[PDB]
Amino acid sequence: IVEGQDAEVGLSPWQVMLFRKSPQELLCGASLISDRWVLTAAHCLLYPPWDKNFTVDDLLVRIGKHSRTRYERKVEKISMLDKIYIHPRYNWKENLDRDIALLKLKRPIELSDYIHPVCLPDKQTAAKLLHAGFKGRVTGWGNRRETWTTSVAEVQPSVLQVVNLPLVERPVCKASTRIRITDNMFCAGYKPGEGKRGDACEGDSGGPFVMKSPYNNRWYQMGIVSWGEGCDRDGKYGFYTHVFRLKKWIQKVID
């Protein structure tokens, strides 16, 4: 998270880190939507150009963490995966359209103060909440800065990071890039004249973009961190997979 701040303990209880089994490395973010299901970005799993195609055997999922500098053992869960569901119309060749994946956990998990699922949106909530200018929130352990060379300096939070970003109108999103944006994706982030900054960065993808409903006091997952050109560049925005548009697919793979 470029320009975010340290998350509060218990801030994001649906956060999930997708790790590489051995050598263990953080590959992406993810979120808990039930005691058996984790939601993430397909590209975190399959990207043919880089011969990437992880299986349930090279993966591990960590849950209940807001500080990456220790094995939080007592509040933290590590689970193996049972199954991986990738959208059959995911597009890695041209623009990562339908960049969504579902991970079934091996065994259900025991919720706690630190482990609790977020809500998927319904027809009326997406209506109320999806308006340019409304702010959502992105979380993750990814890099705190984009960069050149190595830039191995800093860029690695020891605590989960948070940044709230505004929803940008579709026409501004389309004109910021020469990539064909589809209806299964929305962009968020500040405009050049807003002075403020913030964006998702490497290692944050697959993570959640949530918004709190004033009508029921609940947090709802509106997007999945998907892609962008660089991190926090002026005139550019981050692109998120539109959860509500993919709601149908999510529903078919759970029943």
Binding site: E8, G10, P13, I33, C119, P214, W219
Partner: peptide
């Protein structure tokens, strides 16, 4: 779930987090 989106250390505790007002302020703009 059915009790999704309500946090144990926040909503359940009538405690609003540090940056929540920034979100709400954006809604009524």
């Amino acid at each position: 779930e059915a009790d999704c989106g309500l946090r144990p250390l926040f909503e359940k505790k009538q405690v609003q987090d540090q940056t929540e007002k920034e979100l709400f302020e954006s809604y009524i703009e």
